[PDB]
C-alpha cells in the first residue's frame, strides 16, 4: 500500500481537526495535553490582555506548539484511518450491479429474469451464466466452471470451482469465464464476511485488545505520575523564591507525559489492521490477533488444505483372485452419482482404460450413500449385494462384517502404495475385496520452505489427517512437519484443541470443511480457508484469501509487529524523559535557583529556547514516528531473549540518545534563525 | 579507604548470604504450609485453645483478617498511649500523651513506618515502650511476612482460589521466626553492652561534679525486633546512635545483618518455593547491584565531605559532623544506605549533617518505592510490582503475551499493579505540597536554604514509604505535622497492601503455563539490567524535580 498519497493526506487533513473539538475524551493521555493547550492559550490571551505581566510571545509560541502537537497526534490517527478507508474503498468491489437472475426450479430450468438483489433471503437459488459478476456468496450444488478471483483476492489465476466436494465455494464479485454456475444464498447480503470487513472500518467501533487496555492503564498511570510531579513543582519553587509560571509547568508536563505512544497507539492498531488485511487475510477482531503472537502448535488439514484437492487416480491394481473388468464395472458405478473428485476420477480413468458403456447414472434407482468423514463409507446398491467403498479401516471392518478374512498381499500392496505416496481407496465387490485405487495427490509448492521458517520461528506444525498411517509419513517426509495424528476421526481434532488449550498452550489451526466448523469455532487463532464453506467462514475468527495453508506465519508477523511496535514506542517515550529533564529542569529555575545552570550538559542558549526546543522535539518525534507506527518495527525470527536485547539496544539507550541530539539540533536551529 | 569500604561491602554481603541461606529453606517451609521440624503437638493444642483451624480462605478474607488485626492493634495502641499514666511500670511518672502525638505514634507503630516525633526517654514509660511498641513491631513484621507469604502462595498455586489462613500464618511466623532470633540478637546485645532492666533513672554525679540523669529500661528487647523486623524507632531519641543501643561495631554489624536478613531470606524462599533458584537469585542480583552502587556513591560523598571544615583548620575533610566516633564514616554511610533502603528507621548518623549528594542518594532510595532489600515483605511485594511492570514491558518488546512464572498478566493485574505503584508517590508529592504551602508546615524548618525543603521532602517520603528515619531537624511535634504524617503512613501502607492482596486473588484464579521453547527467560544479566533500569527510571522520572530543588540544589550551590 502507498504510505502517503498527497491527495488522501490533504483529504484527511480536515478530519485531523474534526477530531480536535472534545473528541479525545476516550484518549486520556492526549486529553491531558489538550487541557494543557487550552490552559496555555487562555493564560496567553489573558497575559497579552494586560494582566499577569510577562513575555506573552513565549507563552503564545508554547501554546501553538502544544496545539500542533495535538494536531500531529490527530494526523497520525487520521492517516491510519484514511489508509484503512482507502483499503476498504479498494475492497468495495463490483457487485453494485444487482442484475441477478431469479431461478425457480433448483436445476437448469431456464428462469432468467432481472431482479434486485436487495430482497435476496436465505433459501433463494440464483443461476447466472459466464461473463457476469455473481451477486453474493455462492455454494455451488451442481455445475462447475472457471472463475476469476482477481477483484476479490488480488491476483488473476484460472481456478476451477466444482460442486459436491469441499471446493464448492465462490465469493461475490468474481467474474465467470467458461460455464454457468449455481449460487446458493447461505447468508443475507450485508451480513457476509466481506460486508463485515468493509463496514466495521467505516464506523468507530474499535473494541480494543486487552493488551491495549493494559498499556492504556500504564500510560494513564505515567500521566498521573508526571501530573503530580508538575503540580507539586509549583509550591517548591514558590517557597524557594519567585514561583515558576504556569506555562513552563505545562510545557514540562507535556514533554514528560507519554505523548509519543499515547498518540500513536491507535495509529499502530489501525495501521496494523490495514497491514493485516494487506496480506490478503482478514481479522474481524484484534483480540485473537494479539494472542496469535503467543502460539506454539499449528494444526493442518491435508485433503483440500495443504494439497490442492481434486484427488485424481493414476493406475488401478488387481489382486490374486480378480480380473480387471471386474474392477472396472464396480468402479464406474461405486460413485457414479456422486460429485466427488475421486469418484469422477475413477469413472474417467475406468472409461479411458476400458470404455465400459454401462448405465449412465443408474438402472432405475439406487441407494446413493453419502460420504461421511467419520465413517469413511459410500456405496450404491441396485443389482449386486451391498457393494461399497471407503478407506482402509472402513473396508477392513466391513470385511469383518461380511467376509472376515482379509488379503495380506493386498495389505502389502496398500502399504507400498502409501509409501509411494497415493491416498488409498478400496471398493467392495460384495463379499470380498478386489484391491486399492491409487490416488496420486499433488501438493502446493513452497510449504517445505515456509514450514522450515516456522520451525526456525518456533511453531510446532502438526498434521491432522484421517486417511492412513503411512500416507501421513509419506506426506510429512516431503513437506517437513512434526509428528502427525493419522487415522483419526474428525472428533479427534475437536478433542485435541481442548487438550492443548487445557495445558495452558494456545492452539491455532486452519480448515475449510463443514465438519471442521466446531474446531474453527472453538480454536483460538482459527483462520478460514477461502475455498471453504460459509459455516467455516463464520466459525473462524479470521479468513484467508490466498488459498494458502500457512498464512499463519504472516498472521504472527502482523501480531508480533503490533506488540513490538507498541512496546518499542512505549520504551522510547520513557527514555525521552531524562533528556526532557536535562533540557527543562535547568531552564525552569534560573532567577530563583541560579546554581542549577551547571546541569546544562547540552549547553543550550537560553532557558526559554531550551523549553521551546523541548516542546518542538516533543512534536517532531511524534510526526517522525508516524511512519514507524504505520510500517511496524522490523521483526526477525530469533531467540526471544536476543530479540529483547535488540529491542532494548534500539529503543532504550538509543531512544535515550535521540532526544539529546534532537533538542540540541532544534536549539541550534533556533539560535541561528535568531527568533530566541 | 576505598579498598576498606569495598571490603566492608564484600564481607557484609558474604556473611549476609551465609546467614540467609538456612533461613530461605525455613521460610519456604512456612510458605508451603509445611510444619517445622519441631512442633510436637504444641501447634495443635495452641490452635485448639485459640479457636483456629487448618482452614483455607480466599484473598478477601485474608486481607480482611490482616486489616482487622492491624486496626484492632492500632485502637489498642491509641488507647494505651492516651491513657499512659494509668498503666503501671512508670518510674518517671510521665504523663499521658497528646491526642495528636498518641495517634501519630500509634499509626507509626502499627503501619511499620515507625516515625518518632518525640524523645523516648522523656516521652514514654517502660510499660508503654514494651506493650505499645515491641508487641506492635512484632505484629507489623508478621503482617508484612504474612502478606508476602500470601503473594508467593498465589504465585505458586494453580487453580486454587484460597490463600491459606492468616491466623496460622501470623502465629507460626511470630513464634518461630521473629521471637527466637530476636532472643539470640538481644542476648548478643546484652553481651556487647546494651540495656535491659526496669530500674528508675539512675542519678549520676560526673567526674567534674555536674548532674547527669541516665535513662534505663528494656532497650535490648526493643532493639532485637527493631532490627529483625525492619521496624524503626529506638528506646531513646538517638535511634541506634545511643551507646545504650549500639555499644560496639559487632553490635552494629549484627544490626545490619538483622535488617537485611528477612528480605534476603524472602527472596531465597521465593527461589526455593518456585522450584528453580534462578528466579530467586535474579531478584537478589537486582537488589545487590543498586545497593552496591548507592553504598559506594554515599561512601565517596562522605569521604570527600565538607571543604569548609578543611578551610577552617581541620586536618580531615571527612564530614564527621553528627556521626558516631566508635563507628567509622564508611560504616555510617553503609548503615545509612541500609536503613534508607530497607524501611528501617535506625539512624547511625542524624542524616541531616550529611553532604548534599550523600543525603540525595538515600532519600532517592526512599523515594523509589522501598524495593532495594526493602522493608519486611513490603519491599518484596513492591519489587514484585516492578517485576510485573518489567515482564509486561518485556512481553511487549518480544511480541509475546505478558506472562510471569507461567501466569498470564491480565488487565486486572495491570490495574491493581498501577494503583499499588501510584499510592506511594502521590502521597509523597501531595504531603510535600501541603507542607510547603502552610506556615505551620514550614515552621518546623531548621536548616535555611534548599536543605530545609530537603528535610520536609525526606520527612514526607519516609512517612509515605514507611521508613521512619528522619533528618531530625524537622520539629514534627506539631499537631498538623503529626496528623499529616499519620494519615500519609496509614493510607500509604494499607493502600499498597489492599491492591497487592487483590493481585494475589486475581492470580489464584488463574493457572500456570508450562515453559516451552521461545519463551522469555526471566533471569540472567539482560533481565536483571532491564528490571534495574525499570526501577531506576520509575523512581527517577517521578522525583528528579524534587531532588533538583532539594539536595541537588544544595550541592550545586
Amino acid at each position: 500500500a502507498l504510505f502517503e498519497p498527497t491527495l488522501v493526506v490533504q483529504a484527511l487533513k480536515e478530519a485531523v481537526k474534526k477530531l480536535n473539538p472534545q473528541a479525545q475524551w476516550r484518549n486520556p493521555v492526549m486529553f491531558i495535553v489538550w487541557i494543557g493547550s487550552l490552559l496555555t492559550t487562555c493564560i496567553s490571551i489573558a497575559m497579552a490582555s494586560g494582566a499577569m505581566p510577562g513575555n506573552a510571545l513565549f507563552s503564545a509560541a508554547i501554546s501553538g506548539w502544544l496545539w500542533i502537537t495535538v494536531l500531529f497526534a490527530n494526523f497520525a490517527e487520521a492517516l491510519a484511518e484514511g489508509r484503512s478507508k482507502a483499503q476498504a474503498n479498494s475492497l468495495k468491489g463490483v457487485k453494485k450491479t444487482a442484475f441477478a437472475r431469479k431461478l425457480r426450479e433448483p436445476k437448469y430450468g431456464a428462469a432468467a429474469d432481472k431482479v434486485p438483489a436487495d430482497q435476496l433471503r436465505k433459501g433463494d437459488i440464483v443461476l447466472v451464466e459466464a461473463g457476469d459478476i455473481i451477486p453474493c456468496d455462492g455454494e455451488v450444488i451442481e455445475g462447475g466452471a472457471s472463475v476469476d478471483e482477481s477483484a476479490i483476492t488480488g491476483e488473476a489465476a484460472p481456478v476451477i470451482r466444482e460442486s459436491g466436494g469441499d471446493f464448492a465455494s465462490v465469493t461475490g464479485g468474481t467474474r465467470i469465464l467458461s460455464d454457468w454456475l449455481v449460487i446458493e444464498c447461505s447468508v443475507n447480503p450485508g451480513e457476509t464476511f466481506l460486508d463485515r470487513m468493509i463496514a466495521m472500518v467505516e464506523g468507530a467501533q474499535r473494541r480494543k485488545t486487552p493488551n491495549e487496555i493494559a498499556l492504556t492503564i500504564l500510560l494513564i498511570a505515567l500521566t498521573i505520575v508526571f501530573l503530580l510531579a508538575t503540580a507539586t513543582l509549583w509550591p517548591f519553587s514558590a517557597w524557594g523564591g519567585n514561583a515558576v509560571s504556569v506555562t513552563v509547568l505545562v510545557a514540562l508536563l507535556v514533554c514528560l507525559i507519554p505523548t509519543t505512544i499515547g498518540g500513536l497507539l491507535s495509529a499502530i492498531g489501525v495501521a496494523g489492521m490495514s497491514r493485516m488485511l494487506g496480506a490478503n487475510v482478514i481479522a474481524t477482531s484484534g483480540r485473537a490477533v494479539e494472542a496469535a503472537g503467543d502460539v506454539d502448535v499449528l494444526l493442518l488439514d491435508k485433503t483440500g488444505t495443504i494439497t490442492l484437492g481434486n484427488r485424481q487416480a493414476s493406475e488401478f491394481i488387481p489382486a490374486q483372485g480378480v480380473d480387471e473388468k471386474t474392477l472396472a464395472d464396480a468402479a464406474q458405478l461405486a460413485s457414479l452419482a456422486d460429485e466427488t473428485p475421486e469418484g469422477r476420477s475413477i469413472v474417467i480413468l475406468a472409461k479411458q482404460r476400458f470404455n465400459l458403456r454401462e448405465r449412465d447414472v443408474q438402472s432405475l434407482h439406487a441407494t446413493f450413500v453419502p460420504f461421511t468423514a467419520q465413517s469413511r463409507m459410500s456405496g450404491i446398491n441396485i443389482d449386486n449385494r451391498m457393494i461399497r467403498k471407503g478407506s482402509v479401516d472402513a473396508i477392513r471392518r466391513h470385511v469383518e462384517a461380511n467376509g472376515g478374512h482379509f488379503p495380506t498381499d493386498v495389505d502389502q500392496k496398500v502399504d507400498q502404495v502409501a509409501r509411494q505416496g497415493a491416498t488409498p481407496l478400496v471398493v467392495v465387490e460384495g463379499s470380498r475385496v478386489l484391491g486399492v485405487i491409487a490416488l496420486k495427490d499433488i501438493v502446493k509448492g513452497g510449504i517445505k520452505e515456509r514450514f522450515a521458517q516456522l520451525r526456525k520461528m518456533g511453531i510446532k506444525t502438526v498434521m491432522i489427517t484421517g486417511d492412513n498411517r503411512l500416507t501421513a509419513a509419506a506426506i510429512a517426509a516431503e513437506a517437513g512437519v512434526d509428528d502427525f495424528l493419522a487415522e483419526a476421526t474428525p472428533e479427534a481434532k475437536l478433542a485435541l484443541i481442548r487438550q492443548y488449550q487445557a495445558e495452558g498452550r494456545l492452539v491455532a489451526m486452519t480448515g475449510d470443511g463443514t465438519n471442521d466448523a466446531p474446531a474453527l469455532a472453538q480454536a483460538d487463532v482459527a483462520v478460514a480457508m477461502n475455498s471453504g464453506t460459509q459455516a467455516a467462514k463464520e466459525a473462524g475468527n479470521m479468513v484467508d484469501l490466498d488459498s494458502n495453508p500457512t498464512k499463519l506465519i504472516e498472521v504472527v508477523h502482523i501480531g508480533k509487529q503490533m506488540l513490538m511496535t507498541r512496546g518499542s514506542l512505549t520504551t522510547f517515550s520513557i527514555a525521552n524523559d531524562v533528556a526532557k529533564y536535562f533540557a527543562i529542569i535547568p531552564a525552569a529555575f534560573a532567577a530563583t535557583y541560579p546554581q542549577l545552570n551547571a546541569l546544562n550538559i547540552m549547553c543550550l542558549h537560553s532557558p526559554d529556547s531550551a523549553i521551546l526546543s523541548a516542546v518542538i522535539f516533543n512534536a517532531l518525534i511524534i510526526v517522525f514516528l508516524i511512519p514507524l507506527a504505520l510500517k511496524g518495527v522490523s521483526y526477525k525470527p530469533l531467540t526471544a531473549s536476543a530479540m529483547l536485547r535488540r529491542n532494548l539496544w534500539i529503543y532504550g539507550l538509543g531512544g535515550l540518545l535521540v532526544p539529546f541530539i534532537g533538542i540540541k539540533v532544534i536549539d541550534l536551529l533556533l539560535t541561528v534563525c535568531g527568533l530566541v | 579507604m576505598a579498598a576498606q569500604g569495598f571490603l566492608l561491602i564484600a564481607t557484609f554481603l558474604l556473611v549476609l548470604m551465609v546467614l540467609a541461606r538456612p533461613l530461605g529453606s525455613g521460610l519456604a517451609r512456612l510458605i508451603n504450609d509445611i510444619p517445622l521440624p519441631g512442633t510436637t503437638g504444641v501447634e495443635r493444642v495452641l490452635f485448639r485453645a485459640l479457636g483456629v483451624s487448618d482452614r483455607e480462605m480466599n484473598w478477601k478474607q485474608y486481607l480482611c483478617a490482616i486489616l482487622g488485626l492491624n486496626m484492632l492493634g492500632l485502637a489498642v495502641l491509641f488507647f494505651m498511649l492516651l491513657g499512659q499514666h494509668y498503666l503501671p511500670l512508670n518510674p518517671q511518672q510521665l504523663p499521658g500523651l497528646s491526642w495528636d502525638l498518641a495517634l501519630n505514634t500509634a499509626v507509626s507503630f502499627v503501619t511499620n513506618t515507625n516515625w518518632q516525633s518525640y524523645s523516648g526517654e522523656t516521652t514514654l514509660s517502660y510499660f508503654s515502650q514494651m506493650a505499645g511498641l515491641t508487641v506492635q513491631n512484632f505484629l507489623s513484621a508478621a503482617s508484612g511476612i504474612a502478606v508476602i507469604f500470601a503473594l508467593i502462595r498465589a504465585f505458586t498455586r494453580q487453580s486454587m482460589s484460597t490463600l491459606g489462613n492468616a491466623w496460622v500464618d501470623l502465629l507460626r511466623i511470630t513464634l518461630w521466626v521473629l521471637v527466637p532470633v530476636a532472643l539470640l540478637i538481644a542476648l548478643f546485645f546484652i553481651q556487647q553492652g546494651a540495656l535491659q532492666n526496669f530500674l528508675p533513672y539512675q542519678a549520676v554525679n560526673t567526674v567534674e561534679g555536674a548532674q547527669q540523669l541516665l535513662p534505663m529500661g528494656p532497650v535490648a528487647s526493643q532493639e532485637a525486633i527493631k532490627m529483625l523486623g525492619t521496624n524503626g524507632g529506638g528506646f531513646f531519641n538517638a535511634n541506634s546512635s545511643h551507646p545504650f543501643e549500639n555499644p560496639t561495631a559487632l553490635t552494629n554489624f549484627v544490626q545490619m545483618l538483622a535488617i537485611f536478613l528477612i528480605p534476603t531470606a524472602l527472596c531465597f524462599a521465593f527461589g526455593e518455593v518456585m522450584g528453580d533458584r534462578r528466579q530467586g537469585r535474579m531478584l537478589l542480583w537486582a537488589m545487590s547491584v543498586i545497593f552496591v552502587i548507592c553504598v559506594g556513591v554515599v561512601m565517596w560523598a562522605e569521604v570527600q565531605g565538607n571543604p569548609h571544615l578543611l578551610a577552617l583548620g581541620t586536618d580531615s575533610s571527612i564530614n564527621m559532623e553528627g556521626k558516631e566516633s566508635r563507628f567509622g564514616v564508611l560504616v555510617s554511610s553503609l548503615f545509612a544506605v541500609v536503613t534508607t533502603a530497607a524501611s528501617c528507621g535506625a539512624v547511625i548518623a542524624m542524616h541531616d549533617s550529611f553532604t548534599a549528594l550523600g543525603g540525595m542518594v538515600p532519600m532517592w532510595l526512599m523515594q523509589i518505592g522501598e524495593v532495594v532489600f526493602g522493608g519486611v515483605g513490603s519491599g518484596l511485594y513492591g519489587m514484585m510490582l516492578f517485576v510485573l511492570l518489567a515482564v509486561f514491558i518485556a512481553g511487549l518488546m518480544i511480541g509475546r503475551t505478558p506472562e510471569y512464572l507461567g501466569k498470564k498478566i491480565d488487565v486486572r493485574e495491570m490495574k491493581l499493579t498501577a494503583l499499588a505503584i501510584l499510592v506511594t508517590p502521590t502521597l509523597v508529592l501531595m504531603g510535600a505540597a501541603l507542607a510547603m504551602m502552610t506556615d505551620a508546615g514550614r515552621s518546623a524548618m531548621l536548616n535555611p536554604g534548599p536543605h530545609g525543603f530537603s528535610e520536609v521532602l525526606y520527612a514526607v517520603s519516609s512517612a509515605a514509604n514507611n521508613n521512619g528515619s528522619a533528618f531530625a531537624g524537622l520539629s514534627a511535634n506539631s499537631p498538623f505535622w503529626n496528623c499529616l504524617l499519620a494519615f500519609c503512613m496509614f493510607v500509604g501502607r494499607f493502600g499498597v497492601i489492599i491492591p497487592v492482596m487483590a493481585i494475589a486473588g486475581s492470580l489464584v484464579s488463574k493457572k500456570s503455563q508450562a515453559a516451552s521453547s521461545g519463551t522469555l527467560p526471566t533471569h540472567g544479566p539482560l533481565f536483571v539490567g532491564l528490571l534495574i533500569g525499570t526501577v531506576l527510571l520509575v523512581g527517577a522520572l517521578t522525583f528528579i524535580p524534587a531532588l533538583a530543588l532539594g539536595p541537588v540544589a544544595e550541592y550545586l550551590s
Binding site: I32, A231 | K415
Partner: peptide, 27 residues
C-alpha cells in the same frame, strides 16, 4: 492560599480525578 492558587489546585484535582476514573474504567 490565593484565588489563583486554589483555582490551580482545583484544576489539578479535577485532572487527577479524571485520570483515576480513566484508569479504573479504561474498558
Amino acid at each position: 492560599m490565593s484565588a489563583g492558587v486554589i483555582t490551580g489546585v482545583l484544576l489539578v484535582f479535577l485532572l487527577l480525578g479524571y485520570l483515576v476514573y480513566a484508569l479504573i474504567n479504561a474498558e
